Design an enzyme around this catalytic site. Structure first.
Site, mmCIF file in Angstrom:
data_model
loop_
_atom_site.group_PDB
_atom_site.id
_atom_site.type_symbol
_atom_site.label_atom_id
_atom_site.label_comp_id
_atom_site.label_asym_id
_atom_site.label_seq_id
_atom_site.Cartn_x
_atom_site.Cartn_y
_atom_site.Cartn_z
ATOM 1 N N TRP A 1 -0.550 -8.959 4.248
ATOM 2 C CA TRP A 1 -1.766 -8.317 4.574
ATOM 3 C C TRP A 1 -2.727 -8.485 3.545
ATOM 4 O O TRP A 1 -2.810 -8.208 2.358
ATOM 5 C CB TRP A 1 -1.733 -6.708 4.731
ATOM 6 N N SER B 1 3.224 -7.114 2.012
ATOM 7 C CA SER B 1 2.175 -6.312 2.777
ATOM 8 C C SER B 1 0.802 -6.658 1.954
ATOM 9 O O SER B 1 0.429 -7.852 1.509
ATOM 10 C CB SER B 1 2.074 -5.141 3.090
ATOM 11 N N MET B 2 0.166 -5.718 1.539
ATOM 12 C CA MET B 2 -1.062 -5.954 0.388
ATOM 13 C C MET B 2 -0.509 -6.667 -0.846
ATOM 14 O O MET B 2 -1.327 -7.005 -1.417
ATOM 15 C CB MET B 2 -1.614 -4.635 0.049
ATOM 16 N N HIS C 1 7.377 -3.752 10.212
ATOM 17 C CA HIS C 1 6.564 -4.118 8.984
ATOM 18 C C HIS C 1 7.284 -3.901 7.763
ATOM 19 O O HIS C 1 7.156 -4.093 6.554
ATOM 20 C CB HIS C 1 5.139 -3.240 8.905
ATOM 21 N N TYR D 1 0.831 -1.373 0.179
ATOM 22 C CA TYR D 1 0.091 0.035 0.034
ATOM 23 C C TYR D 1 0.853 1.254 0.159
ATOM 24 O O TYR D 1 1.732 1.391 0.702
ATOM 25 C CB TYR D 1 -0.801 -0.053 1.118
ATOM 26 N N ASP E 1 5.413 -6.291 14.076
ATOM 27 C CA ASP E 1 4.557 -5.681 13.095
ATOM 28 C C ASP E 1 3.277 -5.222 13.801
ATOM 29 O O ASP E 1 2.740 -6.152 14.218
ATOM 30 C CB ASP E 1 4.240 -6.609 11.931
#
Length: 259
Positions: free
Chosen positions: A155, A130-131, A207, A60, A175
């Site tokens: 994520w 992540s995303m 993270h 993101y 995280d």
């Protein structure tokens, strides 16, 4: 005996730095491709061999440079890595998985001649942060022919992914953006028990641990990609009977540790 075996016999320290292959880059323009926002391809030079492909997704608001180092690292160890830029920095995991599929299609069909000369289109994998890790899992659901998947501090609102594609999930113990007890760990636990899966947890990492050269992330990502994209058993040693002091937890169904 193994046609896809590349590079010298690996030692662990040799996996904490760039590999034997020189790396060139190509800048995939935002407007030259449809389905994703371009990116950067890193591919070996000074070699006539062919190497498997990897599609990488940042997270993101992030862009491809956030994984540049990693896109270089795997490349120097013998891979064609395309780290993508998304159409929007505010895109979510499913859109990022769609764009990863678009980037794989581009890599196979529309990449430059120099990139295409080094690519084995029959051996492909995906990684993300992540995303982008959630997108890694989603595309592993959509494209079951992929050889491997490495979600880094993933994520996603969805925790369940039905995929046979082997997954190495990296979680960061500290995280707070994508907590491991809410993301990485539930994603590992909900992966099918027949799918070979590894969960590595970086002790005290936050993270942003994958956004700079990281020894453990490099070692385990190279090991997973070699073991599944190259069928290279020489890297099994780094993924089995693990006692890594940088890791606060290691889980695996141990389906990769056998002959």
């Amino acid at each position: 005996s193994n046609p896809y075996q590349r590079g010298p016999n690996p030692t662990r320290s040799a996996l904490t730095t760039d590999g034997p292959f020189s790396v060139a880059t190509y800048s995939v323009s935002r407007l030259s491709v449809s389905g994703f926002g371009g990116g950067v391809i890193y591919y070996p030079t000074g070699t006539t061999l062919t190497f498997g492909g990897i599609a990488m997704s940042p997270g993101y608001t992030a862009d491809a440079s956030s994984l540049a180092w990693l896109g270089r690292r795997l490349a120097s160890h013998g891979f064609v890595v395309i780290v993508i830029n998304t159409n929007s920095r505010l895109d979510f995991p499913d859109s990022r998985a769609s764009q990863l599929s678009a980037a794989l299609n581009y890599l196979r069909t529309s990449s430059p001649s120099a990139v295409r000369a080094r690519l084995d289109a029959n051996r492909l994998a995906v990684a993300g942060h992540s995303m982008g890790g959630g997108a890694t899992l989603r595309i592993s659901e959509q494209i079951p022919t992929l050889k491997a998947g490495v979600p880094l501090t993933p994520w996603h609102t969805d925790k369940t992914f039905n995929t046979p594609v082997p997954q190495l999930i990296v979680g960061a113990e500290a995280d707070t953006v994508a907590p491991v007890s809410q993301n990485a760990i539930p994603m590992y636990q909900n992966l099918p028990s027949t799918t070979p899966k590894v969960y590595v947890e970086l002790d005290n990492a936050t993270h942003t641990a994958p956004n700079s050269p990281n020894a453990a992330i490099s070692v385990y990502t190279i090991s997973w990609m070699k073991l599944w994209v190259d069928n290279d058993t020489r890297y099994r040693q780094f993924l089995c009977n693990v006692n890594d002091p940088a890791l606060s937890d290691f889980r695996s169904n141990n389906r990769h540790c056998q002959l």
